[PDB]
Design an enzyme around this catalytic site. Structure first.
Site: not given
Ligand SMILES: [Cu+2]
Ligand SMILES: [Cu+2]
Ligand code: NI
Length: 310
Positions: A62-63, A125, A127, A197, A199, A269
């Site tokens: 996804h990312h 990271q 995802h 960014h 949520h 966030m």
């Molecule tokens: Cu993602």
């Molecule tokens: Cu966050």
């Protein structure tokens, strides 16, 4: 795509190399799994990151985010990013988002890393969204190829991070604004890209440069769209005496309890990542604003900052 016998380091020429930063053949067992891994820079001397090439599985990733730091959160092969990314400050360098293709660094522009003061590690990271492709039980080595050089770059890339800390979103509340502002006090930076960014409660995120009371748009995005680094519509200088101003618009609708700033999905966030370049002799690699120094200034914020992107 798994790195076999050749390993993560490709010689490009005398002073350049490609470093492949990939997951060590991981196999997620649940949806929306966040995996992190680290790589020490193979050189101690100062180096410059001048390009990024994504190596993602187009059926499962996804990312991806890549950070620079000195203290990765784990000493392990790989970990769940819930444990953390870095224990010191994680400096974002690169974001890859499904369905929102990244934009190349301008030529002549590089992030400085390694050496005495630069990042000693990369943390990646990944995802993993839809894990239906892992019915094979196959090992995944998605990640990023970074182009490093020893050759000093005339223009240094850095990050100006604007982030909320005190935000409280009462339940049911139609509109909550999270405002961020700081005076700029360094040499000129030119903003070339931005990332937003939040949520699930975030509706819109906007960043501005305010000079003599005039608001200039850096970036404005729906944070529910893929959170890539987006090119700035027009290059924007930020200069001594300017104020940087950002607003995240949230709702409380759908929540039974209050939502505050934190790391989990039941938290929020308000982050705006302003990617800039500076003349090498003037450059600093990172700045952060976690304050709201001119809150009354927000009375003249453009109306688009309160309106959702259609
Ligand atoms: Cu993602
Ligand atoms: Cu966050
Ligand atoms: Ni300029």
């Amino acid at each position: 795509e798994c790195l076999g016998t050749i390993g993560p380091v490709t010689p490009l020429d005398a002073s350049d190399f490609a470093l492949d930063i990939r997951m060590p053949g991981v196999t997620p067992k649940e949806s929306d799994t966040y995996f992190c891994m680290s790589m020490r820079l193979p050189v101690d001397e100062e180096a410059f990151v001048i390009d990024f090439k994504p190596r993602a599985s187009m059926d499962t990733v996804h990312h991806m985010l890549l950070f620079g730091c000195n203290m990765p959160s784990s000493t392990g092969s790989y970990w769940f990013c819930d444990e953390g990314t870095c224990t010191d400050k994680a400096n974002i360098l690169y974001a890859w988002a499904r369905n929102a293709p990244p934009t190349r660094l301008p030529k002549g522009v590089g992030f400085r890393v390694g050496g005495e003061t630069g990042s000693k590690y990369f943390v990646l990271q990944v995802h993993y969204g839809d894990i239906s492709a892992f019915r094979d039980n196959h090992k995944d080595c998605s990640g990023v190829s970074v182009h490093l050089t020893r050759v000093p770059q005339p223009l240094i890339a850095g990050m100006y991070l604007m982030m909320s800390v005190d935000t409280v979103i009462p339940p049911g509340e139609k509109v909550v604004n999270a405002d961020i502002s700081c005076q700029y006090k360094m040499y000129p930076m030119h903003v070339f890209a931005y990332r937003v960014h939040t949520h699930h409660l975030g509706k819109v995120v906007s960043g501005y440069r305010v000079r003599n009371g005039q608001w200039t748009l850096i970036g404005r995005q729906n944070p529910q769209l893929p959170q890539a680094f987006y090119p700035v519509e027009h290059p924007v200088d930020v200069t001594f005496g300017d104020i940087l101003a950002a607003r995240c618009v949230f709702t409380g609708e759908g929540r039974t309890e209050a939502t505050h700033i934190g790391g989990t999905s039941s938290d929020e966030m308000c982050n705006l990542y302003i990617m800039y370049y500076m003349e090498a002799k003037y450059a600093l690699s990172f700045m952060t604003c976690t304050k709201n120094v001119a809150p009354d200034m927000f009375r003249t914020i453009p109306a688009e900052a309160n309106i959702p992107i259609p």
